[PDB]
């Protein structure tokens, strides 16, 4: 099993995967069979890791994980488009805190009901570079670590919304933390 502690990008066992951090040395990544990859990290500033795809799409994604946080931290489907540039967050389980923006709706899927948020990030770390952009976010009304989530039905309520995307760069099954300790494993696969 391969552990990557440095910012970088790539494919492991047929699997797209990234890694990035603002605190080099405070967290790591550890690769394993197919669509799985654990994370551990100790007094960490920003982190975000996971594996997926490196084009993403309406695919319906079934993930198990286990999921350990101390603090502020995340376990989420995490993309990018450009075109509009914007990021997007469909957030299954949270730590200390579960994230908000301005509400915009619910949808039900995958039998969970999900608030609908848009936030705005302002001179900050992008595809692109430094830019700001729109986050559209799906948050589970309630905590779960294992599940089938269909994409679409979430691209869908965020049109509905008037929340639209533009063409696909990544999309990861991901672990995000913000400071503080934890670790995760998590396993995705498409369908």
């Known amino acids: 099993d391969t552990t990557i502690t440095q910012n970088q990008t790539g494919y492991d066992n ?33 982190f975000k890791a996971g594996k997926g795809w490196s084009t993403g799409g309406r695919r319906t994604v079934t993930y198990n994980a286990s999921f350990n946080p101390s603090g502020d931290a995340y376990l989420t489907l995490y993309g990018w488009t450009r075109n509009p540039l914007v990021s997007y967050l469909i957030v299954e389980s949270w730590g200390t805190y579960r994230p908000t923006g301005t509400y915009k709706g619910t949808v039900t899927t995958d039998g969970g009901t999900y608030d609908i948020y848009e936030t ?31 994409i679409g039905n979430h691209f869908d309520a965020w049109a ?12 990861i099954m991901a672990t995000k933390g913000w400071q503080s300790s934890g670790s995760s494993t998590v396993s995705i696969s498409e369908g």
């Open 14 to 46: 047929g699997y797209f995967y990234s890694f990035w951090t603002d605190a080099p040395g405070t967290v790591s990544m550890t690769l394993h069979s197919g669509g799985s990859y654990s994370t551990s990290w100790r007094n960490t500033g920003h």
């Open 160 to 171: 509905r919304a008037g929340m639209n995307l533009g063409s696909h760069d990544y999309q």
């Open 120 to 150: 705005w990030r302002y001179n900050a770390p992008s595809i692109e570079g430094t830019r700001t952009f729109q986050i559209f976010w799906s948050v589970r009304q309630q905590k779960r670590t294992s599940g089938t989530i269909t």
